[PDB]
Structure formats: structure tokens, C-alpha cells
Amino acid sequence: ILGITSKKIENFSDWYTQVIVKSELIEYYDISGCYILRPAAYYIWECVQAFFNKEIKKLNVENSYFPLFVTSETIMYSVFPKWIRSYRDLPLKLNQWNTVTREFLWQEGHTAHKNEEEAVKLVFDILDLYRRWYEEYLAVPIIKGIKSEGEKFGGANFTSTAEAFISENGRAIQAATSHYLGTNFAKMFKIEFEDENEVKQYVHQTSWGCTTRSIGIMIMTHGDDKGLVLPPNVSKYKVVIVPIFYKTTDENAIHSYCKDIEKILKNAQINCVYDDRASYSPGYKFNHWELRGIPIRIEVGPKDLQNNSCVIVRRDNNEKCNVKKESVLLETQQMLVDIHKNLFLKAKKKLDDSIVQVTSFSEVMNALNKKKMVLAPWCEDIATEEEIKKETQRLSLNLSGAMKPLCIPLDQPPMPPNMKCFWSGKPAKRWCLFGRSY
Ligand SMILES: COc1ccc(Cl)cc1C(=O)NCCc1ccc(S(=O)(=O)NC(=O)NC2CCCCC2)cc1
Numbered sequence: 001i002l003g004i005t006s007k008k009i010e011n012f013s014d015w016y017t018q019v020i021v022k023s024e025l026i027e028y029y030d031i032s033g034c035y036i037l038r039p040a041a042y043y044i045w046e047c048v049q050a051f052f053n054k055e056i057k058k059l060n061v062e063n064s065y066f067p068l069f070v071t072s073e074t075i076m077y078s079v080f081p082k083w084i085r086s087y088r089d090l091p092l093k094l095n096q097w098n099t100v101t102r103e104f105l106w107q108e109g110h111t112a113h114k115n116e117e118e119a120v121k122l123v124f125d126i127l128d129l130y131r132r133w134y135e136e137y138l139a140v141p142i143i144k145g146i147k148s149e150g151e152k153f154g155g156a157n158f159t160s161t162a163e164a165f166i167s168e169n170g171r172a173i174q175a176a177t178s179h180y181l182g183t184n185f186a187k188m189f190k191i192e193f194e195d196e197n198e199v200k201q202y203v204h205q206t207s208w209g210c211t212t213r214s215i216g217i218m219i220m221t222h223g224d225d226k227g228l229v230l231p232p233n234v235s236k237y238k239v240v241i242v243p244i245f246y247k248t249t250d251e252n253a254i255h256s257y258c259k260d261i262e263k264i265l266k267n268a269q270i271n272c273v274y275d276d277r278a279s280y281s282p283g284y285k286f287n288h289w290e291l292r293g294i295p296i297r298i299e300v301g302p303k304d305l306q307n308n309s310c311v312i313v314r315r316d317n318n319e320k321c322n323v324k325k326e327s328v329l330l331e332t333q334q335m336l337v338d339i340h341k342n343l344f345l346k347a348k349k350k351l352d353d354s355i356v357q358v359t360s361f362s363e364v365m366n367a368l369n370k371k372k373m374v375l376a377p378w379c380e381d382i383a384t385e386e387e388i389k390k391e392t393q394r395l396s397l398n399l400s401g402a403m404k405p406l407c408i409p410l411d412q413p414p415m416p417p418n419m420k421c422f423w424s425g426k427p428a429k430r431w432c433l434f435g436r437s438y
């Protein structure tokens with residue numbers, strides 16, 4: 001009852017709710033579904049917040065706060081004409097860190113540029129920062145792409161997106177967005193400027209956001225039947241030290257030895273916890289910290305005193321090795337790196353193995369039935385989006401069983417000149433990724 005009672009594959013929904021509560025990420029307030037972000041969850045948000053802030057500031061984006069909202073977007077663009085008069089006032093680059101299933105925390109950026117080229121470059125610069133956000137900190141692989149006309153934001157010229165995929169239930173989920181808004185809102189609010197030639201021009205706008213859904217995607221990606229699995233970059237404690245006594249003493253020697261290891265790690269700015277609670281067995285502690293997603297366990301028993309060593313246990317694959325005491329710092333540092341690398345790579349394999357490249361709709365149900373996505377040549381006719389939804393829904397009988405256009409990947413496979421649309425039989429335009437979704 002203390003651990004996870006539902007297998008991730010067999011009952012994904014119940015598994016997830018158990019993991020997020022028992023790992024002490026969240027705490028449910030009442031029956032409304034409202035929840036509290038405990039330190040373990042907020043810490044992850046703080047890590048990626050710190051990363052994102054440093055990177056957008058390199059792009060001269062400035063943080064700010066706009067408190068007025070309308071049902072849900074921020075009141076902002078109508079103020080821009082008061083700030084923009086000439087090309088010297090451009091580019092305007094703003095970001096806000098907001099607080100408000102539902103999502104409590106998120107980030108939202110807005111820019112305005114003198115032309116299309118500069119705005120579009122920012123759109124994709126930001127999009128890659130989202131990629132790094134997921135990869136370098138959450139160890140989650142994403143796919144960058146363009147939304148179809150039927151799935152893009154209404155006010156956007158085009159919507160670029162990062163897509164993640166949960167292989168266990170065969171569903172894609174939108175991980176982040178970066179819109180090119182063109183001049184759509186500039187026309188609405190007369191957001192105009194005089195260029196270098198004293199000519200009136202429309203500003204070109206972008207908006208981009210990412211929420212705490214990123215944390216959920218991380219959990220769903222890496223979590224296992226033992227509970228939470230944290231990439232070291234978003235775990236407060238990198239290491240837990242567990243003492244092992246055999247009642248034959250010396251507990252004090254073990255205790256002292258563990259404190260030596262704790263000191264070495266902490267002196268190297270590697271935060272860790274020494275679980276010296278007398279009331280709980282070592283086996284109890286193993287579960288306790290595995291459940292909470294601690295990347296590395298260091299065990300110390302009698303044999304380790306004898307051999308001047310310690311046992312290191314990886315959280316991601318449960319592999320154990322003996323390590324000399326004088327080598328603990330270096331090997332722990334390398335282990336933390338390799339754990340992140342392994343989490344990403346094994347997640348990327350599951351993602352790559354989830355994409356079935358097809359040329360005909362007759363290949364689609366085979367891929368959906370195996371809980372995968374399809375990559376197909378598509379004429380991109382907006383009317384066909386609903387047709388494809390309705391038909392895949394009909395053929396599967398099945399929380400939606402429909403597949404939708406996820407994104408047109410920035411990385412396109414070659415397109416043969418005479419390639420037809422997998423659905424309409426018309427000339428294909430580009431390869432599009434289709435799948436079931438959240
Ligand atoms: C619809 O139910 C299901 C029915 C059947 C199956 Cl087979 C699976 C599911 C399912 O969907 N199971 C996961 C339920 C789920 C997962 C992710 C999201 S979310 O959008 O990503 N939101 C967040 O993660 N917030 C995080 C939570 C952790 C702390 C920090 C904030 C929202 C809900």
C-alpha cells in the first residue's frame with residue numbers, strides 16, 4: 001500500500017495519480033480536483049524557469065507582469081501602440097511568468113518585430129529553447145513541427161509546436177507552442193511604426209508558451225512501477241545514502257562512514273540526504289526514496305567498511321556497482337550524467353519506434369492498433385482533417401479513438417515529385433504526423 005499498486009501499462013490512469021501523490025509532488029486540497037504543488041514539484045519548475053530565463057535574456061527578452069486577463073488571454077496588444085512609434089522602439093520583447101486537468105503555472109512570451117524574417121527567426125529560436133528545456137532538463141525527446149490549418153491558433157499566421165508521445169497509451173501530447181502572429185493583431189489595434197525610410201509599417205508579432213504540463217510529460221515518460229523517476233537536473237537530492245546494519249555492530253562506524261560520503265558530495269555542491277532514521281529498515285528506505293525519484297542510492301554496510309567501498313544503485317535501471325570510497329565523488333558525477341543520457345536515449349528510442357511511415361490510408365489502422373503514430377504524405381486540405389478523424393474513429397470503434405494531425409515535422413523525409421496524398425489521392429504537399437492525442 002506504501003508503494004505503487006497499479007502497473008503503468010495495465011492501468012495508466014490510476015498509476016499516474018498514485019505516482020504524483022505518493023512521490024509527494026502534489027497534494028489534493030479537496031474533491032474539486034484542485035491540488036497543491038509541493039516543493040518536489042515546484043523545484044522542477046524552478047529549474048526549468050532558471051534555464052529559460054537565462055536563455056531568453058540572451059535574446060534581449062525582458063520579464064514583466066500584466067495582471068489583467070479576459071476569458072483565457074492577457075490584455076496586452078491594445079497597449080502596444082503606446083510603446084511603439086518608430087523602428088528604434090523595435091523589437092519589443094516581453095515575457096511573463098504566470099500563476100492561475102487544469103494547469104497552475106506557466107510562461108508566456110510576446111514579441112513585436114519590424115519585419116517577417118526577424119519575427120519568424122525568433123519563433124524558431126524559442127521553439128528550440130523549448131526543445132532544450134525538455135531534453136537537457138526533463139530528458140524528454142520532442143518533435144518540432146508546424147500545426148495544420150485546422151489545429152493552429154486562430155489568430156496565428158502559423159503555429160509551430162513541440163510534440164511529445166506517451167508510448168504506453170499510444171497518445172501524443174502538445175508540449176509547447178511558438179506562434180508567428182504576422183500582422184493580424186497589428187491591424188486590429190493599429191500597432192504601427194515608421195521604418196528607416198519614414199514609412200508606416202505593421203509590426204510582426206510572435207507569442208510562445210509552455211506550462212507545468214512539461215512536468216507531467218516528464219513523469220509519464222520516465223516513471224515506472226516503482227514510482228517517480230527524476231532526471232538529476234530537476235531533483236533536489238541527487239543522492240540518498242542508506243546505512244545497512246546487521247545488528248552485529250558497529251552502527252557508529254557505519255554512521256561515521258556515511259557522514260564522510262555525505263560531506264564529500266555536499267562539499268562538491270552535490271545535494272544529498274543521509275537517511276539515518278533508526279526506526280526503518282534499509283529495505284523500507286530503498287522503496288521510500290525510489291518512490292520519490294532520487295537518481296542515485298549509495299548503500300553502506302559492514303563489507304563496505306572492510307573494503308573501503310560503497311554500493312551505488314542507479315534509479316533508472318537498478319544496476320549496482322562497487323565503488324572505492326576515494327572514487328565516489330567522480331563516479332557519482334559521471335553516473336548522474338549517464339543516468340540523464342540513458343533516460344533520454346531510451347525515451348527517444350520509444351519515440352522513434354512509435355512513428356510508422358506510410359504512403360496509404362490502408363496502412364493506418366495497423367499502426368493505430370499497435371499504439372503508434374503515422375507519418376504520411378498529405379494534401380493538407382482542411383476538410384480532410386475531420387474526414388480522417390471520423391473514419392479512424394469509425395474503424396476503431398473506440399478518450400477519443402480518432403487520429404488528428406499532430407504536426408508537419410520541421411525534419412521532412414524526401415518527397416517524391418509524383419507522391420499522392422495518402423487520403424484523397426490528390427498530390428501530396430508535405431509529410432504530416434498523425435496520431436491519437438490528449
Ligand atoms: C483521461 O485519463 C486517462 C484515461 C485512460 C488512460 Cl489509458 C490514460 C488516461 C490519462 O490521461 N492519465 C494521465 C492523466 C493526466 C496526465 C497528464 C496531464 S497534464 O496535461 O500533462 N498536466 C500535468 O501534468 N500537471 C502536472 C501534474 C504533476 C505536478 C505538476 C503539474 C493531465 C492528466
Ligand SMILES: [Cl-]
Pocket residue numbers: 074075076077078079
Ligand atoms: Cl489587448
